[PDB]
Amino acid sequence: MTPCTVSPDFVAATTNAGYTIELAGGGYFSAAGMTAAIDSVVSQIEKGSTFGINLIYVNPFMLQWG
Amino acid sequence: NGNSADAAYAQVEIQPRANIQLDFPELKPYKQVKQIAPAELEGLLDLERVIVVTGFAEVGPWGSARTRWEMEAFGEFSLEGCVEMAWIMGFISYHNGNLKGRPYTGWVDSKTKEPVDDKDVKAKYETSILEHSGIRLIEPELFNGYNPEKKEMIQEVIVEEDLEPFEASKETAEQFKHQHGDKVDIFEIPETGEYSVKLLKGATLYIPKALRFDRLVAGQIPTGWNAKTYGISDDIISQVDPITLFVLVSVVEAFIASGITDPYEMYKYVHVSEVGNCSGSGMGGVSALRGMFKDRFKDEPVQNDILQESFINTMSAWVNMLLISSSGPIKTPVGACATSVESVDIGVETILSGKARICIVGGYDDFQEEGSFEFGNMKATSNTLEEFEHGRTPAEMSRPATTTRNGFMEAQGAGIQIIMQADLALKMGVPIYGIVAMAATATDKIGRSVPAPGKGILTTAREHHSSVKYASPNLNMKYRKRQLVTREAQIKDWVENELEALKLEAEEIPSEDQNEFLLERTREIHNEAESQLRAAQQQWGNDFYKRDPRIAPLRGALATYGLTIDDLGVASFHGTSTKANDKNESATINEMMKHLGRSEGNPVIGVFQKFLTGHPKGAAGAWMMNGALQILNSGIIPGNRNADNVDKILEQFEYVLYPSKTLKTDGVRAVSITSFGFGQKGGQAIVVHPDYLYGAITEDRYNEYVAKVSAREKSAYKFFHNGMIYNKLFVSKEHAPYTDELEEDVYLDPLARVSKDKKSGSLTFNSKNIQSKD
Amino acid sequence: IADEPVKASLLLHVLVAHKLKKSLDSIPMSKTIKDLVGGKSTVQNEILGDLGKEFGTTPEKPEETPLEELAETFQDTFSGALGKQSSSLLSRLISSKMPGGFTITVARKYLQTRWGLPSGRQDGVLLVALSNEPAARLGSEADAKAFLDSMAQKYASIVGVDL
Amino acid sequence: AKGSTLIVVPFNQGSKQDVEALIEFIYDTEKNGGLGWDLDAIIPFAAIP
Amino acid sequence: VMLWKEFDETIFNLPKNKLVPTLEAKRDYIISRLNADFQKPWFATVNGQARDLATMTYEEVAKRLVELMFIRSTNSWFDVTWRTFTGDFLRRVEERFTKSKTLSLIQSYSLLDKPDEAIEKVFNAYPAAREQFLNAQDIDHFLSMCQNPMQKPVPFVPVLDRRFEIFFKKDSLWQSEHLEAVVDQDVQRTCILHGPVA
Amino acid sequence: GVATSFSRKKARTFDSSWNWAKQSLLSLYFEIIHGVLKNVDREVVSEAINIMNRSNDALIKFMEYHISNTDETKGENYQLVKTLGEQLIENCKQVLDVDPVYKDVAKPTGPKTAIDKNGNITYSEEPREKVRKLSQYVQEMALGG
Structure with a gap:
């Protein structure tokens, strides 16, 4: 979801909650923009916890670096 | 310490951009301005009978007014002037979009489409600006290949022997048969239907040769000037004469200078019958004359209506058809070199009579082959060969009031001003550049030399000094104010008496008709009361000196604003750099000041603007007006830089000064414009500093004026730059404000005004406003 | 014969026509990208993506502005290089077709x-x-040469060349 | 100053013919197209580096 | 969202030739509704009075930019690029009204963190810009900055032209998560995605 | 080099000082009023000398008028120029029908060579500490070294 599931904090909260959520790529524009978010999720989660990425297929200029 | 140490110590520099202002006159606080005018001036003058110049413009050998003023006053272009000059001569063009792959918004070289920055414009172009502007060697490009080094004239010859036969069409053959009678043999060629023409011995023939003329230099509009730049379409520039273009561009520029970007805005305050166009021209559409005199006989392809383009009145007429569409007074005067001043004169009466309330005044004339040659035959222009023999350069070949002056430098172009009724100018809150205090013309005498000037304009200083022991009370303003207080007390009492009398007459009228009857008669009572007040103001404040033979109209116009003859610190001489003119004029003004008892050792400072721009013939005086209107509003008196050595003979004229450099003064009060055309066309006009007029109104009316002028300025600035970047300053009106249907109904209504239509957003006439009781 | 670097109008036309599996003449330029494949939403975006890769920068709202004006909008920034997309294509x-003897490099010097006809x-x-x-x-290289x-001939007819 | 008169004349002191042409022009009478001057003092400071 | 829908029905549906004459006719309505009801207000508005970029004074534009981008409640720029935009626009004022080569009053955009103390400084250095409208060139430069694709889209419709849709629809999602960066912190202006069944 | 450039016709003649005086005086007047030349500029003296070297009745009445009309109430500058005014009028009455004199008052300057920290060579004409008039200049010249 954009922009509910762009927040690294929200994703982290759901992943530690013992449930699958996906970090939305829709609410980022830059490679480091996604990377800084992802490293924020990683820091917050507990070891061996997993989460996904959602990429919007109406934005090819987001895909080409995503 | 790495580069990051001295990266933050590396500072950004903010390079200037050109910000071309419309330099409206500055409006002092009412406290300050009240201390310039005396106490009695308040409420004294009829503001409906004061002519103010509200917007001036020229197109000349230094492009627009402001650039001409910079070059005149200072001698160098500022950044703002220099960028304008580059814009006028198509060196630089605006471009908004993507340039070469980077998005760019600003100046580009109109030839190579590369970015040009405002700072750099000067260094890049100034050289190309100066060598292609102002008085210079005639550029064949701008006068249809006219080369004064190789002047083409056609010589009559009789042929000695039979000519080789040539192909001629049946229509050319038969016209050649009618032309030459039996001296030409024509034959039909049966193969083609084409004809073979052989001219027989002794037949008439014409051989073109060459002729090396001696007038290689003139004052041409800068190289690259183009109507289209301002925003004139190809149709208009194709149909009209280059002179008409100068007029159009001058007119519109004068309208932006006046803060009127929509000419229909004027009809929000006045009727379409009350906007005259009293501009003139010494010759008019001279390229049309050429068309129908040379090119017609040579049978070159010429437009069908070329005759109509040649009339002096036609250029004015195009203005009306394209910008104004006013049905007001049209009066086109011709005053050879003085035309513009005579024009200004005409405008004043057209406003004093009350026929119109706004007029477009000034002159315009083009430089051409025929003109330059006939002027060289008359020995009026400087013999350029003579001047080169002396090692004089082109720019310093017009040198007025100089011992070695030898004739005038012909120039081309168009000066325009916009005169308005003070009260109307205050009402519209247009900037006020200056007051035309006086505008008069007089023919000299009887004689047998038409070009020879005389002392006709001296008559402006005519006043009878048979008994001058006691000063007239009419020269003291206090007397006149007191008399105005008595007369207004009478007017008051007359209004009172007409109010009781109406009440008693309306008493007889029944109650149902009583309202209408009282309205109808109250309107007339207001009208007449107003009329009388103005009448009193006219008789005491404006025309107090009309019937007095002990006051000169010239003194009179100054005393109107409590100005003494001493206050006229500047007099813009005609200064055509001719032997006759620059002595005759000088003498004329010296006597003028001597007879009116100009305080000893107070000479008028002579400016000879013609030393820069040369002599545009008709427009001549118009340019001086513009120069004068600047001087008053800048305090700057520009020197005669070409006056290298003042002529010895002038020294007798104690009351004239001939400066050779610019003087920053503490304030100039008034300025004299004297012109002396061919045919004894003498003319003078006195412009007075605007500041005095404000003295004549209340602090309130001045404040709301100031606010209006402030807002109008901003609007004008905005529109000017908009039109200047997108080449749409000139916007040819598509329609008249009124439809065809309402045309007659509008004309017959002396109270119909234009209103903003919601759908269009433009100013047009609404059927609700026509003969409406509101 | 003189060389000419490929325009953005032809390279845009072949990219758009290739992804459609249509002839170069079946697809008119004077039409919006949205008018072409309005049927499907995926095909529109993978068209834009492949155009983005080949030319780098694309204008705002490409699909609703027809092909012809896009041609010169790529042309001014683009500089006659096969890029990345057309290099893989x-x-x-x-490699997918059967010129089993001759590769791209032999195809170039044969033409x-x-x-x-040089590089461009x-x-x-x-x-x-x-x-x-x-x-x-x-079949073999004899069909491939006749196809080349x-x-x-088609390049020469569309562009306006003679051999 | 009052009475003073400055005459700027093109010249080339290098040229033999300019020298006597100038001298003549200064000493020739005003009617004949000279100055009709008698020179009190000469300052021949012309020089090229 | 209801104005969004109204514009989809009335304005954006039209073909490209007929958008401009419909836009210029409807201008006054479209500005009023954008001010009153949309998250992206009509930029050229001073004291609720509807104006245009042509009829704005530099000081009016600077202020407005500070009002629409700078967050007073947090006392920091919403986005760094916006600060760079405003900084750039100050640099352009300085470049317009200076009379020779000088030094940049804003040596770094770090000094914009206090907006009013940079505005008052610049417009004290250049007092003519308080009372002059935007030079046409500066308007068209200000629009070219607005179109920049290396910055967060500006949170206002600067101009009505062919491109109005883009201004009206680009990046219309983030405003929900930050109400402090809206006109009146009013949700009713913003666009919040939702499922009608859920 | 030996191309003949001299011609009689090209000669330029300047003889019109009678006007130039009044120009030069009115420029001075304004210069003082507009805070350009103050009561501590040598150029005031210099220009006063140049004006005196052109004295006649026409110039005298021109001064008389302009200085009388001046209003010292307007500003300090006006008072100053008005005072220098009457002073000049007295001076140019006194030297009427006197031979106009070359009179140099220019501050005598000696040479200075400066080197900044970067090594930029700078030549300046610095006013001499000892010699501050031509009189003193002659004295120093007489005394030798």
Whole structure:
């Protein structure tokens, strides 16, 4: 979801909650923009916890670096 | 310490951009301005009978007014002037979009489409600006290949022997048969239907040769000037004469200078019958004359209506058809070199009579082959060969009031001003550049030399000094104010008496008709009361000196604003750099000041603007007006830089000064414009500093004026730059404000005004406003 | 014969026609990208993506502005290079099809000598060959040479060249 | 100053013919197209580096 | 969202030739509704009075930019690029009204963190810009900055032209998560995605 | 080099000082009023000398008028120029029908060579500490070294 599931904090909260959520790529524009978010999720989660990425297929200029 | 140490110590520099202002006159606080005018001036003058110049413009050998003023006053272009000059001569063009792959918004070289920055414009172009502007060697490009080094004239010859036969069409053959009678043999060629023409011995023939003329230099509009730049379409520039273009561009520029970007805005305050166009021209559409005199006989392809383009009145007429569409007074005067001043004169009466309330005044004339040659035959222009023999350069070949002056430098172009009724100018809150205090013309005498000037304009200083022991009370303003207080007390009492009398007459009228009857008669009572007040103001404040033979109209116009003859610190001489003119004029003004008892050792400072721009013939005086209107509003008196050595003979004229450099003064009060055309066309006009007029109104009316002028300025600035970047300053009106249907109904209504239509957003006439009781 | 670097109008036309599996003449320029494949939403975006890769920068709202004005909007920034997309596309053209003897490098010097058309005129003929894909199996190099002849005729007819 | 008169004349002191042409022009009478001057003092400071 | 829908029905549906004459006719309505009801207000508005970029004074534009981008409640720029935009626009004022080569009053955009103390400084250095409208060139430069694709889209419709849709629809999602960066912190202006069944 | 450039016709003649005086005086007047030349500029003296070297009745009445009309109430500058005014009028009455004199008052300057920290060579004409008039200049010249 954009922009509910762009927040690294929200994703982290759901992943530690013992449930699958996906970090939305829709609410980022830059490679480091996604990377800084992802490293924020990683820091917050507990070891061996997993989460996904959602990429919007109406934005090819987001895909080409995503 | 790495580069990051001295990266933050590396500072950004903010390079200037050109910000071309419309330099409206500055409006002092009412406290300050009240201390310039005396106490009695308040409420004294009829503001409906004061002519103010509200917007001036020229197109000349230094492009627009402001650039001409910079070059005149200072001698160098500022950044703002220099960028304008580059814009006028198509060196630089605006471009908004993507340039070469980077998005760019600003100046580009109109030839190579590369970015040009405002700072750099000067260094890049100034050289190309100066060598292609102002008085210079005639550029064949701008006068249809006219080369004064190789002047083409056609010589009559009789042929000695039979000519080789040539192909001629049946229509050319038969016209050649009618032309030459039996001296030409024509034959039909049966193969083609084409004809073979052989001219027989002794037949008439014409051989073109060459002729090396001696007038290689003139004052041409800068190289690259183009109507289209301002925003004139190809149709208009194709149909009209280059002179008409100068007029159009001058007119519109004068309208932006006046803060009127929509000419229909004027009809929000006045009727379409009350906007005259009293501009003139010494010759008019001279390229049309050429068309129908040379090119017609040579049978070159010429437009069908070329005759109509040649009339002096036609250029004015195009203005009306394209910008104004006013049905007001049209009066086109011709005053050879003085035309513009005579024009200004005409405008004043057209406003004093009350026929119109706004007029477009000034002159315009083009430089051409025929003109330059006939002027060289008359020995009026400087013999350029003579001047080169002396090692004089082109720019310093017009040198007025100089011992070695030898004739005038012909120039081309168009000066325009916009005169308005003070009260109307205050009402519209247009900037006020200056007051035309006086505008008069007089023919000299009887004689047998038409070009020879005389002392006709001296008559402006005519006043009878048979008994001058006691000063007239009419020269003291206090007397006149007191008399105005008595007369207004009478007017008051007359209004009172007409109010009781109406009440008693309306008493007889029944109650149902009583309202209408009282309205109808109250309107007339207001009208007449107003009329009388103005009448009193006219008789005491404006025309107090009309019937007095002990006051000169010239003194009179100054005393109107409590100005003494001493206050006229500047007099813009005609200064055509001719032997006759620059002595005759000088003498004329010296006597003028001597007879009116100009305080000893107070000479008028002579400016000879013609030393820069040369002599545009008709427009001549118009340019001086513009120069004068600047001087008053800048305090700057520009020197005669070409006056290298003042002529010895002038020294007798104690009351004239001939400066050779610019003087920053503490304030100039008034300025004299004297012109002396061919045919004894003498003319003078006195412009007075605007500041005095404000003295004549209340602090309130001045404040709301100031606010209006402030807002109008901003609007004008905005529109000017908009039109200047997108080449749409000139916007040819598509329609008249009124439809065809309402045309007659509008004309017959002396109270119909234009209103903003919601759908269009433009100013047009609404059927609700026509003969409406509101 | 003189060389000419490939325009953005032809390279745009062959990219759009290739992704559709349509002939280079079936697809008119004077039409919006949204009018072409309004049917499907995926195909529109993968068109934009492949155009984005080949040319780098694309304008705002490409799909609703028809192809012709986009051509010159890519042309001014673009500089006559096969880029990345068309480099993979010609590489799959040569490798997927059956010119088993000769590769892309031999295809270039065959056109270059036997016709006389240099690098920029090679790219242009390769874009004709991409839009007219044989698809079905071709016998050998004798069919391939006859196809390269016909693709040099189509390039020459559209652009306005003579051999 | 009052009475003073400055005459700027093109010249080339290098030229033999300019020298006597100037001298003549200064000493020739005003009617004949000279100055009709008698020179009190000469300052021949002309020089090229 | 209801104005969004109204514009989709009335304005954006039209073909490209007929958008401009419909836009210029409807201008006054479209500005009023954008001010009153949309998250992206009509930029050229001073004291609720509807104006245009042509009829704005530099000081009016600077202020407005500070009002629409700078967050007073947090006392920091919403986005760094916006600060760079405003900084750039100050640099352009300085470049317009200076009379020779000088030094940049804003040596770094770090000094914009206090907006009013940079505005008052610049417009004290250049007092003519308080009372002059935007030079046409500066308007068209200000629009070219607005179109920049290396910055967060500006949170206002600067101008009505062919491109109005883009201004009206680009990046219309983030405003929900930050109400402090809206006109009146009013949700009713913003666009919040939702499922009608859920 | 030996190309003949001299011609009689090209000669330029300047003889019109009678006007130039009044120009030069009115420029001075304004210069003082507009805070350009103050009561501590040598150029005031210099220009006063140049004006005196052109004295006649026409110039005298021109001064008389302009200085009388001046209003010292307007500003300090006006008072100053008005005072220098009457002073000049007295001076140019006194030297009427006197031979106009070359009179140099220019501050005598000696040479200075400066080197900044970067090594930029700078030549300046610095006013001499000892010699501050031509009189003193002659004295120093007489005394030798």
